[PDB]
């Protein structure tokens, strides 16, 4: 519960979830994408190149 | 669930539990007062006898419904594998931006 | 841990994981391939 | 005495996020490029599909 | 203040081209390695915007040699340099690219130019052409042109740039850039032991 | 009021940021946009679609402003690179899962409940609020949900 | 003064207001120009036998938002460049932080 | 000479995608490009000139 | 090869 | 008659139900579907915001 | 598990004539459009839209 | 008697599948190899005389 | 949590638990008239004192 | 005096040498040669002064 002061215009709060999204680059021959991409704290990663 | 007197929003908060097996889903839209409420077995509200769309199977709503939007690990959509051309959102009625 | 084997943060400290041959030019000439990032080194935090 | 009162709460309530979809804002009138603006944010015109 | 003692360089900004040539036949870009085959474009006043930068007119041949001069930027990408590498007589903090709008030639339902030959705005209450007392009444001006808002007037940008303070380097390597004193191809064996000429 | 000129957009992207390119046969596709309002910034704030201000352009241009790659070790950088050995991450200091739950009207409190989901690392939280007038829906592109064009 | 279009003899005694100025410029290097973070307007980035698409980000990334603040890391921010454009949004000191 | 090239090469490409689609707010391009069989090229030099 | 009526047949200068 | 104007489109929708595979491979087979009877899916009970 | 993907593919493409026909009598739609080698264009369901 | 049509811009639609990508570059071989062929024909598979 | 004036209908659905420990349910009324939020260490919240 | 020209249908053409296969696609890479490549000049093989 994320209690605040009250608005007179209404807003957006901004929820920041600090989590990790790196991508990793592969090329095994000259015209490959390998590249994988990841959502680990998310765990919904479930599909990437 | 219903939806408000004039507005038009609504999400799905359902806590966790196994999916084992599934075959699909089927939406469908129908007003309060032309349906009956269960348990009883009588309603003294219920002031409208005839047109149940749901207890009978006859439905005109469906085509109001503007896009199904589907989340189940509050990140990615249904196609977690981004197959289909909007991955996010998926469009019933268009408010018209490209018509192609 | 096993699920970083690929995103290589859990794998190797930060340099060794791709081929250490390539190390020569970034020690030797690196100034015109500046390059560390590329490559982004992994975090580390004692338990 | 004078200010005007209602029986407000908003804790019990949740606030989850509301997705970033192609228009779910409260209400915004706004403006399109040449083509005419939606009126109201979640009002009854937006019904009539309409083309140009 | 003269430019050859406290680098009081000014006309540095009045730039074109100034193509090599090394063997007196051929020129340096001969071998093909840049945009233009032989001219060194400093810069390109509106021909094909791609030759130019976004909010500069110099032609990009030049634009990558600039930054491949002192810093050791244009190949991985473009690195805005830290708080060490410029100093105040090193690039871009002398120049910077700059535009303006006036207006062009003929659009207008009634247009007869005018000069020097009364500035109309506020004159004859401060200034008319020499610093006097209030001598006129209050009007609308002449020569000061808008183009912008309510005002239906239209005219092109005059885009360009202003470089002073700053000297034009080029290295002498195969990539071309000033790794050190001694270059890839400045004092190699073929650019040490044979004699050439210069026609540029 | 009118101001014709180019302008040079390099990659914003977090993974492709700075990458090598092999070698080999590539195809690419970037969208860009023509709604005045959300791309354009005023000092002030006011919409430009319906406000005289439209936006038209002549030619795209793709650059390569790559190194003069060395040819007698051309062969040796490029089949390194062409292992499942070396590979290329792009990390971030902030990792965003920048979803938005807003104080519609006149709110006091605001609380949060996801149900039983996977958490395995994490680095912090942040907050703050912007006003929904001054945002778009970013669904499609463009919508007359946004008019606030500062 | 006068409730009048055209001729009037009271309109002698008008003031006149300045009207507010609005630079219409672009945010700091440029953002909000391509949609990289936006999901129906994704990038396509394939090979030409390959034909996989590489780019996917959804809206719980701002992926302009995200190499911004990064960009607040990477050297001094207050180093100004044209096809770059470092025109970070801001104020003086004494225009907000009210010095009386 | 065991470093950068010493034969032709051009530092840069000035590409042209081959199909254009312009609509309401999108301004797509599908460029069709091919690194050069033997030389590489850099992400963070890569941008558009609109 | 053609997949109508196969047949090998080149000539190097 | 010469006269300007623009027309509008509307779809409808009578006695029928929605209908959606369960299916990597988009296609609504037997009890056993694609992904819906899939163990990644089935796993751990987890969460729901549709 | 035998006949699925676990991979990023799209589902619905839309291309453009490279070259646009403005002639009197005829338009031609000329796409320069090139089928996934890992992908299947199903020539049964592949349509023109006006 | 007055009327006038012009196309504007065509949209080709080839609606492919979601198939198993292992599959999609393994079940192609047979009609890949030079015996194998799709023929397809009508009962109006014919020319005409007028 | 609070029943709000002419809104008798009451929702409770709480996330899921690791609980483990149960002997049963417990439910009563509460009146805000006679309760004020305890938490700061001071209230002037309780304009009452029943 | 009141006159311009402006353009509306513009085409390309390209007449081929309607050749054998056999014979077009041998010296076309015997074109590709190192040393077998293509010059030409001009009658005109003057320079310019202003």
């Not at chain 7, 700091?28 to 394939?46: H, K, Q, R």
């Not at chain 9, 090869?1 to 190097?12: K, V, Y």
């Amino acid at each position: 519960t994320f209690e605040v002061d009250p608005m007179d215009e209404p807003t957006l709060l901004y929820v920041l979830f600090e989590v990790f999204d790196v991508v990793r680059v592969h090329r095994p021959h000259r015209g490959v994408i390998e590249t994988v991409y990841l959502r680990t704290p998310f765990s919904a990663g479930n599909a990437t190149t | 669930y219903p939806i408000p007197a004039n507005a038009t929003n609504v999400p799905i908060s359902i806590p966790s539990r196994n999916w084992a097996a599934f075959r699909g889903w089927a939406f469908t839209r129908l007003k309060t007062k032309e349906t009956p409420s269960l348990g009883s077995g009588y309603d003294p509200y219920y002031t409208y006898s005839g047109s149940i769309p749901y207890l009978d199977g006859t439905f005109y709503l469906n085509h109001t419904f503007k896009k199904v939007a589907i989340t189940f690990d509050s990140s990615v959509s249904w196609p977690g594998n981004d197959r289909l051309l909007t991955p996010n959102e998926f469009e019933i009625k268009r408010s018209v931006d490209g018509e192609g | 841990m096993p699920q970083w084997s690929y995103m290589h943060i859990s794998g190797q400290d930060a340099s060794e994981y791709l081929s250490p041959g390539l190390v020569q030019f970034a020690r030797a000439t690196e100034t015109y391939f500046s390059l560390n990032n590329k490559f982004r080194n992994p975090t580390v935090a004692p338990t | 005495s004078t200010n005007s009162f209602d029986g407000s709460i908003v804790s019990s309530y949740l606030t989850t996020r509301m997705p970033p979809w192609a228009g779910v804002r409260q209400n915004v009138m706004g403006s399109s490029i040449d083509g005419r603006p939606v009126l109201p944010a979640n009002s009854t015109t937006l019904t009539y599909e309409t083309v140009s | 203040s003269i430019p050859y003692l406290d680098g009081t360089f000014y006309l540095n900004h009045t730039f074109k081209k100034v193509a090599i040539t090394f063997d007196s036949s051929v020129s340096w870009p001969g071998n093909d390695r840049l945009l233009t085959p032989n001219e060194f474009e400093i810069k390109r006043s509106v021909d094909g915007e791609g030759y130019n930068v976004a909010q500069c007119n110099m032609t990009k041949d030049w634009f990558l040699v600039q930054m491949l001069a002192n810093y050791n930027i244009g190949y991985q990408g473009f690195y805005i340099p830290e708080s060490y590498k410029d100093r105040m007589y090193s690039f871009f903090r002398n120049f910077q690219p700059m535009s303006r709008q006036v207006v062009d030639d003929t659009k207008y339902k009634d247009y007869q130019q005018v000069g020097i030959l009364h500035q109309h705005n506020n004159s004859g209450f401060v200034g008319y052409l020499a610093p006097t007392m209030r001598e006129g009444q209050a009007y609308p001006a002449n020569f000061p042109y808008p183009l912008i808002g309510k005002t239906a007037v239209d005219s092109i940008t005059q885009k360009k740039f202003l470089c002073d303070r700053t000297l034009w380097r080029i290295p002498f390597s195969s990539n071309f850039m000033s790794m050190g004193a001694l270059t890839d191809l400045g004092q190699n064996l073929l650019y040490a032991n044979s004699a050439h000429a210069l026609d540029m | 009021r009118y101001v014709p000129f180019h302008i040079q957009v390099p990659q914003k992207f977090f993974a492709i940021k700075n990458l090598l390119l092999l070698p080999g046969s590539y195809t690419y596709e970037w969208n860009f946009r023509k709604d005045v309002n959300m791309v354009l910034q005023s000092s002030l704030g006011n919409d430009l679609r319906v406000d005289g201000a439209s936006i038209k352009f002549d030619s795209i241009c793709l650059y390569a402003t790559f190194f003069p790659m060395a040819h007698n070790t051309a062969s040796t950088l490029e089949a390194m690179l062409r292992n499942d050995t070396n590979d290329q991450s792009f990390n971030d200091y902030l990792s965003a899962a920048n979803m938005l739950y807003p104080i519609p009207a006149n709110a006091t409190n605001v609380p949060i409940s996801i149900p039983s989901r996977n958490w395995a690392a994490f680095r912090g939280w942040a907050f703050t609020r912007l006003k929904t007038k001054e945002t778009p829906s970013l669904g499609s592109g463009y919508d007359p949900y946004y008019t606030y064009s500062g | 003064p006068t409730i009048k279009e055209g001729n009037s003899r009271e309109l002698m005694g008008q003031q006149s207001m300045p009207n507010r100025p609005n630079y219409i410029a672009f945010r700091d290097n440029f953002i909000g120009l391509m949609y990289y973070n936006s999901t129906g307007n994704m990038g396509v980035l394939a090979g030409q036998a390959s034909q996989l698409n590489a780019v996917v980000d959804l809206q719980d990334r701002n992926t302009e938002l995200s190499y911004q603040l990064l960009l607040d890391s990477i050297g001094d921010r207050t180093r100004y460049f044209s096809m770059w454009n470092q025109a970070v949004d801001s104020y003086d000191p004494d225009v907000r932080i009210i010095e009386n | 000479h065991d470093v950068t090239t010493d034969r032709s090469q051009r530092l840069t490409l000035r590409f042209i995608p081959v199909d254009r689609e312009d609509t309401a707010y999108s301004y797509k391009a599908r460029f069709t490009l091919a690194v050069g069989d033997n030389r590489v090229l850099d992400m963070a030099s890569t941008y558009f000139d609109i | 090869r053609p997949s109508f009526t196969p047949r090998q047949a080149i000539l190097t200068l």
